Design a binder for this molecule. Structure first.
Ligand SMILES: CN(C[C@H]1CNc2[nH]c(N)nc(=O)c2N1)c1ccc(C(=O)N[C@@H](CCC(=O)O)C(=O)O)cc1
Ligand SMILES: CN(C[C@H]1CNc2[nH]c(N)nc(=O)c2N1)c1ccc(C(=O)N[C@@H](CCC(=O)O)C(=O)O)cc1
Ligand SMILES: O=c1nc(NO)ccn1[C@H]1C[C@H](O)[C@@H](COP(=O)(O)O)O1
Ligand SMILES: O=c1nc(NO)ccn1[C@H]1C[C@H](O)[C@@H](COP(=O)(O)O)O1
Lengths: 287, 287
């Protein structure tokens, strides 16, 4: 069965059985608490086909995470503005971060992934050798003890939450190895089904491909687990259109060079093959 | 429609479709990565009936968590020995904790729930006002902003892992409110289907009941999410006996007085009603 039907059944389930629920943005949602889907990574890549996904944004964002950046400007210069609103002067001031330079998202993914527990100052501070490099520790463990049931990268950092422009939606992920296959499970505390979720699925599918390549393993499964899975009210019509389209076979992901360390990946090393999505569907971002 | 069928279906799924997988204890397992079940908390309590669950241990352990204890002795004195091995002189030394008193589990659940980010010294240290009191913060947010999609309690603390006798199996949990009902999702990175999982299900169902009480809400769902869900090889025959038993209706949990703060709950304030499970099934703990 086509993996994308799981995403579609979830959207359908929220539309039929979800409850109306207010939210921080004042937009309102239809919401379900607790969902799980499994996307095979074996000779296919779960880039959704019922709408075109901004794949370039996914790849640049992840490389930006990996090099430890929490500066939206360093991502916007690549032509990816998905974090620009959250780092804007007006939104930062909206949370009391008046002394903060524009673009500074606070101690979010890049900082927690490479520097968990270090003392956060500025997005451009030097943090070399500070905190826990969870990304490299996950990589080292997969190589030396693939049976380990503790292979976790955690972005949720209660001590640092008050400094984040947006507390991470992807609280943590866990990796798992059996039969030479590398699987990943993401715990997403909050999922915008129309905008973020398709993006996030591709993001962690890519991360698994990158780490599988670095560790000499094959991609297995990506398990997507949701807390508050919601459809914003102004996404109902677009998503009702999207459910009527039929999915096309998932594209493939090719890695064009042999890479030795996670840090050496560059955009040019990746190529999506056979991606024939339905047209884009515009959906406004609740801020 | 009996909630326990979900647990029995998962055990069956691992027995049928799980993979052989080596593990830290050297026992070996049949393993599946990524599972989810939903246990209703509405006028029933998911204490499994196809074998007797050690309800006293569930209750004492949670009260021991809530008051912030990391002292296995303080639990063993109540006649609950589930953590004694992990605090034993020999197991501590097996991890290099030669200077530590017996019973000192390190910065595990109780400390992370009440003092996340504090500098751990010994089990007996005074930590009042140090670190983030995630437990009380969860309660405060549920009362003042029940729509919040960030109601999380996280025990996974990458900076403290090297000090823990056992890194937590319950990495984090999230709370959710809709329609006057309080729900909880547990992310459990590793699940011993035979021993811990039935216990753990009761534990977070109980935690949800306690918080629903102090927040003036009704219990909703407990969503149980597993990473490495496994059956130890020496639990297969015991579990195959359990799978042939048919569930009895779940008991009820009563809270016998109005309690105002999570810290004021006491063992005597709880009563399990109508619990007549099938006989106990002996299953050795892989250590
Ligand atoms: C992960 N992420 C970061 C967070 C930031 N805030 C936010 N707020 C809300 N309420 N829902 C969300 O999910 C997100 N996502 C994304 C943000 C925006 C997009 C996005 O804007 N996608 C467009 C394309 C944009 C473009 O092409 O430049 C689309 O596919 O329709 C994608 C991810
Ligand atoms: C959550 N938990 C803590 C962890 C500790 N280590 C561990 N190791 C393994 N490999 N599987 C597990 O799951 C657990 N569980 C429990 C630990 C032990 C038990 C237990 O076995 N108690 C006995 C004594 C009680 C009595 O006799 O009445 C019993 O249930 O019969 C139950 C939960
Ligand atoms: O779905 C999302 N994926 C993200 N990846 O980085 C980031 C955000 N979101 C969604 C989740 C919420 O709809 C919203 C975050 O708001 P919050 O749950 O109140 O924190 O954006
Ligand atoms: O299922 C469990 N529930 C627990 N609650 O506190 C604690 C432990 N376990 C199980 C999971 C593993 O079989 C084992 C822990 O070993 P580890 O996953 O290698 O850390 O005990």
């Amino acid at each position: 069965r086509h993996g994308e039907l799981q995403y579609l059944r979830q959207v359908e389930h929220i539309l039929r059985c979800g409850f109306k629920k207010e939210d921080r943005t004042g937009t309102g949602t239809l919401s379900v608490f607790g969902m799980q889907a499994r996307y095979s990574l074996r000779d296919e890549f779960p880039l959704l086909t019922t709408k075109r996904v901004f794949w370039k944004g996914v790849l640049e964002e992840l490389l930006w995470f990996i090099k430890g950046s929490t500066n939206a400007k360093e991502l916007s210069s690549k032509g990816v503005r998905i974090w620009d609103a959250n780092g804007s002067r007006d939104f930062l001031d909206s949370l009391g971060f008046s002394a903060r330079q524009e673009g500074d998202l606070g101690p979010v993914y890049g900082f927690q992934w490479r520097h968990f527990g270090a003392e956060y100052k500025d997005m451009d501070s030097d943090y070399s050798g500070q905190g826990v490099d969870q990304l490299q520790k996950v990589i080292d463990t997969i190589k030396t003890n693939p049976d380990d049931r503790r292979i976790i990268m955690c972005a949720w950092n209660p001590k640092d939450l008050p400094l984040m422009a947006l507390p991470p939606c992807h609280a943590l992920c866990q990796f798992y190895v059996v039969n030479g296959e590398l699987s990943c499970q993401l715990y997403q505390r909050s999922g915008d089904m129309g905008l973020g979720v398709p993006f996030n699925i591709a993001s962690y599918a890519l991360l698994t491909y990158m780490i599988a390549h670095i560790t000499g393993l094959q991609p297995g499964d990506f398990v997507h687990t949701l807390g508050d899975a919601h459809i914003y009210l102004n996404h109902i019509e677009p998503l009702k259109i999207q459910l009527q389209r039929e999915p096309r076979p998932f594209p493939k992901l090719k890695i064009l060079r042999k890479v030795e360390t996670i840090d050496d990946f560059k955009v040019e090393d990746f190529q999506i093959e056979g991606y024939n999505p339905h047209p884009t569907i515009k959906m406004e971002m609740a801020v």
